Each structure stands twice: as structure tokens, then as C-alpha cells.
Design a protein around this ligand. Structure first.
Ligand SMILES: O=c1ccn([C@@H]2O[C@H](COP(=O)(O)OP(=O)(O)O)[C@@H](O)[C@H]2O)c(=O)[nH]1
Ligand SMILES: O=c1ccn([C@@H]2O[C@H](COP(=O)(O)OP(=O)(O)O)[C@@H](O)[C@H]2O)c(=O)[nH]1
Ligand SMILES: OC[C@H]1O[C@@H](O)[C@H](O)[C@@H](O)[C@H]1O
Ligand SMILES: OC[C@H]1O[C@@H](O)[C@H](O)[C@@H](O)[C@H]1O
Ligand SMILES: [Mn+2]
Ligand SMILES: [Mn+2]
Lengths: 277, 277
């Protein structure tokens, strides 16, 4: 039993709910979570969530993790992978059933550019290990909290998330890389969306492809003495232009209430930034 | 270069363009065919189209085939499989490049119920052969003509098509099988859509699963001395209830202008019935 979908009365009429390559754009009201939960339960799906907490960012872990336990893939199997240069600093947080956490220890870089940029390398290389332990990988920023449901509706071979400062914008304004000497180069009259670096994912296979390609593309740039304007986010936008995501998450999935409010078009604020100095 | 998809100005606001399990519902204006053509060209995708022309129905082949050459998967590789009890009767029709036709000879059944019903058996068993020759199988009625574009926008692991007499209806009215002694039984408060028997498909693997299951389910019924109300279409609706299609085609893809007109909500009439006695 569930309400009957009605072909001639669209749930959402205020937003675009599918891209021109027929990928769903995920917004409240486009899905029935009970149907989707049923489908994902039947494959006994496991979701991996990677998060980096290097240096002072280990401060963000506790709230990240507590809110992930209330809102992320609740009822499904989750494996948190925390990447950190301080394993002892990882708070002990009580996990629901079928949920686990592993701490993976890594080097720090002095520059914040490289910490964010080397995520691609580092996720890429836990490679044979993700393939056996999980069906999907979701890769997010640690400086964040869950405030509402983030579940299996997002799961697809490849997804990105609409940057919240640019969803209502035109492509000319998108802060893509505009210098043709960077591998992240996107010309002025190309681009579907501007995707944020802080929330992407997909199957293990598609995420390893993305992260390999972004790393291989960041390296090429260095050996040409150039750094992409917005770094990993620049390379992500380039990969996602050429390899179009099979779902696109609305800005419900990456928001900042302080900076942008709660507009009517956003019926839930699911995963939001935390203030930092 | 293409128009920029605009997150806050949905192309179609009059129809539901995605199901509650996040499958696209395919309507004009939801897709950019150039983007999709690009993606499908890059895999060198082959589409198989199966069609049965048993007895007098070989009369429908000529127009079916000619219009398929103007409108079906034009620019992509197509393999027509014509199933018939009269191979000599299959008109010679000139094919575009990368397009072929094979004639597969089969038995006739006196009763029209079994001809339509045994399609499932017969498609199911050309089994090892579809797996090597084609990536997708599309299965349609022969008594039909293409009048507009039917292309790669429909291609997905599994799709069905909204029956044109029932898209604006409620589920209570859907002419599902309502007798619990039939394997096609769907209860009164279940059902997403009423799908027509005349246009379904998907990957080879998903279509062989569907047709196997529908055959295995038709047989079980016979050995219980019962025939489903609307036959293969009844079993299809049951399979698609339990195994939800990954795309749903709008009634643009299965129409009858004589019986229902050309409503404003239908911006193209793509594939339509032909009058018969
Ligand atoms: O010293 C640092 C700087 C960054 N990060 C990681 O890199 C991510 C992205 O950087 P940040 O959040 O600073 O970028 P922003 O969201 O502010 O643009 C952080 O969330 C952490 O996962 C980290 O672990 N240690
Ligand atoms: O004598 C027959 C009756 C049916 N068919 C096939 O079974 C399909 C479905 O039957 P029909 O079109 O009669 O059903 P309808 O569309 O009228 O309900 C036809 O299109 C043909 O592919 C056939 O080949 N020979
Ligand atoms: O334009 C790209 C930039 O946009 C800012 O609003 C955001 O805080 C940065 O993280 C980066 O994404
Ligand atoms: O209700 C099911 C039936 O609906 C009719 O309109 C259609 O012509 C039949 O082929 C069958 O689909
Ligand atoms: Mn951040
Ligand atoms: Mn017919």
C-alpha cells in the first residue's frame, strides 16, 4: 500500500526533477522512501561513507558521526571510513546494528589545498578493499552535520550534488576552470551544472574511476605548474561534464542555512555545513 | 553546446516525469536527444527489435518496417527479429547502414490468445543468440506504425509503457487480474501503473528474466485451469509491479489517434496502432 503516482498531477512543479540525460534530480516529494528501502534491502546493500579528518578537523568528527547515526542510511548496512593523521583523536561513537567504522591513518600536507586535493588520491589507494566491503561509496566533507534524512534515494552508479550558491545561476557565472592549460578546463558555453566537491558518490567501481581520473588530472597540472581554481572541485566538475552522473542531488543535500536561509523551494535541509574559523 | 538545464524552471509542469522509485517517465521535453545519442554512440550500442507476424499479421510488416527505418533508433545499430509462420511473406525492405533483419520461423496456434501469450515463450527460446548479437531488446506489436522519433531515450535495463486508455485513471479501475488463483493476481490496493503488452524492453538479461517469468507464470495458470484476464499483458503488469521498471514510457510511445485524439498533453505521437478488422 502507498499513494498512487498520478501521471497528470506532478508532485513537484516548481523544480526540475530530471536532467536532460534522464537522470533523476533528487528532491523531497519525488520519491517514496518505502519503495526504495524495499529494493535496497533485497540486495542487502552496504554503503561506505568516507570522510577525512586531518589536523584540527578531527574536531568535526563527533557531531558528524552522531548525526550520521540518526540520519544516514538508517536501517541499512553502513561502513564509515575515517581517514586521519590522529587515530587516537577519533571519538568513540556508538553504532546502530549493521554499522561499523574503520580508521585509516594517513600523512598530512601543510597546505590545505593538497589535503582536500589528495582526498582523490587517498580514496583511490584503498582500492581492492572498498570492492569487497561495500557496494556504494559516498564521499563527504567532515565539517558538516546531518539534520534530516539522507538515504538510499541517493544511491546510483554515479552522483553529484548541486552547489547551493549556484543552482539558480547561469553557466557563464559558474566558477569552473577557464584556463585551457589546466586539465580541468571547461569552455564558456559548456556545462550542465556546477557540482560541489563536498558530496559525491556512486558504485565502488564508478567512484574509483572518478577519483583515479581526478588524481591523474591533478598531477598532470602540477607538472605544468598550474593549480585548478577550486582544486578538486574543479576536476570533479570536469569529470562530471564528460561522465554525466546517473543522479543529481538537489541542494537539500548540501546547504548552509546561515549564508542562504531556508527558501520555500527547499522542503528539507538534510546535510549542512558547520561554522569554522 | 546545448540549452542549459535550469533547476528552477522545469521543462514539463503538466505531467509526472519521474516515478516514486526515481525512474524517468519519458515525455518530449524531458530529454536532449543529442546528449543521449552521444552516450549511446560511445558504447557502439546495438538494439534488437522483436516483432511477431503470424498468419494474416504478415500484412502489417511492410508499413511497420518502413516506418521503423524512418523513426526507430535512427543512426544506431538495429537488428530486427521477425518471428513468423510465413518467411516468404516477409517483405523485402531496404535497410539503412548498420541495420539488419533476421526471419525466425515458428509454429502457429489456432487461438489468438496463445499467439500473443506464447510470444513470451518464443522471445525467451532465442536465448544465447540475443546475448551476443544485441545489448537491448525491445518487444512490440506488429500492427503498428512509427509516426515520430522512438530512440535511445527509451533504453534502460527495464522499461514498460503506460497503456493509453488508463494513464489518467485510478488503480481500482485498472484491468489487472483480480482472481487470487491466477499467478497474475494483483490486489485492489496495489499497483503503480497499468502497462500495455504491446511495448516493453530493456537489456537482454532483464528481458530474458521477464519473459521467462511470464511464461513460467502462464504455464502454472494453465495447469490450474485458468487463463489471465488480459493474458500476457496481465502477467507483464504483475512482473512490473514486483520488478519495477527503470524507465516508464509515456503514452506518446503507444497511442491510438482514432480512439483518443491528440490531446495537448501529448506533444508527439510516436508509435500508433493500425486499424484492423
Ligand atoms: O586541515 C584540513 C583541511 C581540510 N580537511 C578535509 O578536506 C575537507 C574540505 O575542506 P574544507 O571543508 O576546508 O573546504 P570548504 O568546505 O570550506 O571549502 C574537509 O572537510 C576535511 O574532510 C582536513 O581533513 N584537514
Ligand atoms: O493471428 C495473430 C494474432 C496476433 N499476433 C501477434 O500478437 C500481437 C498482439 O495481438 P493483437 O495486436 O491482436 O492484440 P491487440 O493489440 O489488438 O490487443 C500482434 O501484434 C502480433 O505481433 C500475430 O502475429 N498473429
Ligand atoms: O565557486 C566555488 C566556491 O564557491 C564557494 O561558495 C564555496 O564556499 C567554495 O567551497 C567553492 O565551492
Ligand atoms: O484493459 C486492458 C485492455 O484494454 C483495451 O483498451 C486494449 O485494447 C486491450 O488490448 C487491453 O490492453
Ligand atoms: Mn567543508
Ligand atoms: Mn496490437
Amino acid at each position: 500500500v502507498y499513494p498512487q503516482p498520478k501521471v497528470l498531477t506532478p508532485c513537484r512543479k516548481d523544480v526540475l526533477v530530471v536532467t536532460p540525460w534522464l537522470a533523476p534530480i533528487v528532491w523531497e516529494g519525488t520519491f517514496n522512501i518505502d519503495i526504495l528501502n524495499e529494493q535496497f534491502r533485497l540486495q542487502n546493500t552496504t554503503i561506505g561513507l568516507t570522510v577525512f579528518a586531518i589536523k584540527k578537523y578531527v574536531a568535526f568528527l563527533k557531531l558528524f558521526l552522531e548525526t550520521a547515526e540518526k540520519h544516514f542510511m538508517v536501517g541499512h548496512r553502513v561502513h564509515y571510513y575515517v581517514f586521519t593523521d590522529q587515530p587516537a583523536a577519533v571519538p568513540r561513537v556508538t553504532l546502530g546494528t549493521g554499522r561499523q567504522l574503520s580508521v585509516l591513518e594517513v600523512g598530512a600536507y601543510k597546505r590545505w589545498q593538497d589535503v582536500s586535493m589528495r582526498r582523490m588520491e587517498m580514496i583511490s589507494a584503498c582500492e581492492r578493499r572498498f570492492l569487497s566491503e561495500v557496494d556504494y561509496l559516498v564521499c563527504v566533507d567532515v565539517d558538516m552535520e546531518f539534520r534530516d534524512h539522507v538515504g538510499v534515494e541517493i544511491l546510483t552508479p554515479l552522483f553529484g550534488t548541486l552547489h547551493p550558491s549556484f543552482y539558480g545561476s547561469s553557466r557563464e557565472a559558474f566558477t569552473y576552470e577557464r584556463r585551457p592549460q589546466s586539465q580541468a578546463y571547461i569552455p564558456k558555453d559548456e556545462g550542465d551544472f556546477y557540482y560541489m566537491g563536498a558530496f559525491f558518490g556512486g558504485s565502488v567501481q564508478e567512484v574509483q574511476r572518478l577519483t583515479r581520473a581526478c588524481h591523474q588530472a591533478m598531477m598532470v597540472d602540477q607538472a605544468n605548474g598550474i593549480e585548478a581554481v577550486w582544486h578538486d572541485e574543479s576536476h570533479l566538475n570536469k569529470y562530471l561534464l564528460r561522465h554525466k552522473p546517473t543522479k543529481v542531488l538537489s541542494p537539500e543535500y548540501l546547504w548552509d542555512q546561515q549564508l542562504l536561509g531556508w527558501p520555500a523551494v527547499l522542503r528539507k535541509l538534510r546535510f549542512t555545513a558547520v561554522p569554522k574559523n
